[PDB]
Structure formats: C-alpha cells, structure tokens
Design a protein around this ligand. Structure first.
Ligand SMILES: Nc1nc2c(ncn2[C@@H]2O[C@H](COP(=O)(O)OP(=O)(O)OP(=O)(O)OP(=O)(O)OC[C@H]3O[C@@H](n4cnc5c(N)ncnc54)[C@H](O)[C@@H]3O)[C@@H](O)[C@H]2O)c(=O)[nH]1
Ligand SMILES: [Mn+2]
Ligand SMILES: [Mn+2]
Length: 269
C-alpha cells in the first residue's frame, strides 16, 4: 500500500500512532512525506532518526523548515527557541542525520500513479520538465560540499515570476520559494510571498496556486503539505492538501493512495 502523510513538525508520537493505525509495513508499503519533518513539535530528533531508517520505504520531499534546520546547522541562520531544534542539533548523530536530510529530493514523481509530490505544490508557471530540472538544480547544490553558500542565498522574496531566462541567485531563490513556500498566486501565476491565510480570507486578486490551471496539475495528481491554514480543505479534484496542522493542535492526516482512504491522528498537544 501507498501512504501519504502531511507535515510532521516533530510530532513523533502522532506519526507512529498513525502508522500503527494503518499497519504500515516496510517492504509491503511505501510512505510519502510532504516535508517539514522538524520544528515546533517536541520530537524532531526521533522523527529524523525514524524517517532516515526507512530507506527505500519512504519518499520524502524537503520543506521550508527542513531547509531552515540545515541553515541553522551550517551556522547560516539563527536558532529560534520556538522551533525546539536543540536536541537534534546537539545529538551525536546530527551530522549523519542532517547530511542525509540535505540529500533528499524537493520533488517526487510516480508515473504509474500519475502522482507528483512537493512540499508546497507545483507552481502553474511550470510544466513537468521544468519542475524536474529545477528540482535537480537545487538538489545538486544542497547535496554538494558547498551547500552552506546556497542556504544563505535562498532567503529572499524575489524574483516571484518564473522565466527560463532567470539566472544565478534569483533563479535558485525562485525555485526554492516555489517548491517550499508557495501558497497564493496572482492571476498570471506570479508568487505572493506574504499571505499565509486561508483562501476565503486572502485579499483579492490572490488565488491558491492550485486554482490556476497549470500543465502539471492537468495531467498529474498533486499531493502537498505546507499550507496549514487550508486545513486540508477546499481543493479541486486531483489536488491533495495533506497538512492538517498537527503541531498546531490540529491533526496528522494519512491518505492511502489505492482507495483514497483517509486516516487521522489527533494532536496530543
Ligand atoms: O509561509 P512560510 O512558508 O514562510 O510558513 P512558515 O512560517 O515558515 O511555517 P510553515 O511552513 O510550517 O507553515 P504553516 O502554515 O504551518 O504556518 C505558517 C503560518 O500559518 C499559521 N496557521 C497555521 N494554521 C492556521 C490556521 N488554521 N488558521 C490560520 N493561520 C494558521 C501559523 O500560525 C503560521 O504563522
Ligand atoms: Mn509546516
Ligand atoms: Mn511549510
């Protein structure tokens, strides 16, 4: 069976309880995770240890909090107390865990399922080939010995409009923002990097990225996390918003792909 779970955010107890609910069995089953494995919840260290141990039985995409953790580890960014990352950062296996984390994808594609996953979704300004090329380019910098320089460059809110002509710092910043921070788009597909509210509460003319017809969404189902204020609701056919806000006192959501059956684990907080 194929199971897809939204943002875990250090909620190790809820993750394990949900996996036990579906009797997740590596070797028989595969788990997809939308990223944001870490921060806010208490168990970021246990989450990363467990997810790394799954190997080929897990398909991860990196989220914005996963990248922030790497930036803190590399001395690029300051540690915020509310993220509760210190047990992980001080762990004796931190190097092992974080060198694994930075090698994981930004994009997962299963052609037999016609299924795409990224943390925030797929901008309507990208076709599949462009999304693949952009994921490869950022995965390449994150996997390299020079990854702290990219982590420092990634912070920024511009450019917010895709073009194949983009180059340099702006190109990687857009790619990072599209995969890991996207929520709202202007009508022409341009990213808005400020509004984090639910679609009904956003100011015009902002619309969800998934409300703008895009070539990937027209051919593939898209699963994503990230947008907790969406509460996993309000999406069109073929769009699966799996982040139901577990670390916020919401729920952790698991979707089984074969029958589109949902399983929910209440927050312990
Ligand atoms: O943009 P960004 O990528 O930079 O986001 P972020 O700050 O980096 O953190 P997350 O990536 O984990 O996303 P989030 O959606 O969980 O929280 C991002 C913001 O929504 C807020 N938030 C979460 N749940 C709800 C909700 N139900 N209603 C209204 N606001 C909500 C949360 O109070 C935070 O202020
Ligand atoms: Mn999140
Ligand atoms: Mn996120």
């Amino acid at each position: 069976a194929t199971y897809l779970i939204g943002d875990v955010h250090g909620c190790y107890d809820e993750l394990i309880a949900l996996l036990h609910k579906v009797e997740f069995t590596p070797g028989k089953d595969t788990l997809w995770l939308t990223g944001d494995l870490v921060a806010r919840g208490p168990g970021s260290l246990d989450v990363l240890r467990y997810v790394k141990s799954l190997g080929d039985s897990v398909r991860l995409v990196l989220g914005n909090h996963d990248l922030h953790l790497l930036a803190v580890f590399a001395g690029i960014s300051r540690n915020k107390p509310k993220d509760r990352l210190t047990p992980l950062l001080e762990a004796p296996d931190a190097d092992e865990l974080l060198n694994w984390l930075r090698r994981q994808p930004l994009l997962q594609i299963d052609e037999e399922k016609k299924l795409v996953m990224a943390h925030a979704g797929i901008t309507p300004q990208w076709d599949l080939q462009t999304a693949k090329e952009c994921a490869r380019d950022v995965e390449a910098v994150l996997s390299s010995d020079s990854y702290p320089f990219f982590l420092d460059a990634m912070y920024g809110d511009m450019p917010n409009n895709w073009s194949p002509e983009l180059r340099g710092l702006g190109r990687l910043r857009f790619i990072t923002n599209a995969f890991t921070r996207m929520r709202f788009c202007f009508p022409n597909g341009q990213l808005d990097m400020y509004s984090k509210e639910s679609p009904e509460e956003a100011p015009a003319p902002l619309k969800p990225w998934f409300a703008i017809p895009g070539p990937v969404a027209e051919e593939y189902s898209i699963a994503f996390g990230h947008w907790a204020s969406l509460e996993g609701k309000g999406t069109p056919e073929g769009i699966y918003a799996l982040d139901t806000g577990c670390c916020w006192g919401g729920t952790l959501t698991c979707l089984r792909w074969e029958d589109k059956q949902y399983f929910v684990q209440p927050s312990n907080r």
